[PDB]
Symmetry: C2
Subunit: 50 residues, 2 copies
């Protein structure tokens, strides 16, 4: 759970699946996480290594 | 629930009580919220107007 602090600025999703702390919305790369997803949790994917 | 995005930079607690999204830790002014408290929710206090 990488805290989204003001210091990190921006984070990109190169090739993998990431989830939010609350919604845990499914995301498919390539795409920018965007500041909307406040918290960035994670899970161990199988098909594509994140 | 003011999302703590990189655009806002920093936010201060002048005189009031604020809570985090998950922990909802009790905070009494004056003090800085700090990036640790990631998502800032709120509640209607009575004794001291936030």
């Amino acid at each position: 759970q990488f805290n989204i602090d003001a210091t990190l600025e921006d984070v990109i999703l190169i090739n993998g699946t990431a989830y939010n702390a609350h919604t845990r919305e499914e995301i498919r790369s390539p795409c920018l996480i965007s500041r909307t997803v406040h918290k960035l949790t994670f899970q161990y994917t199988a098909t594509e290594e994140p």
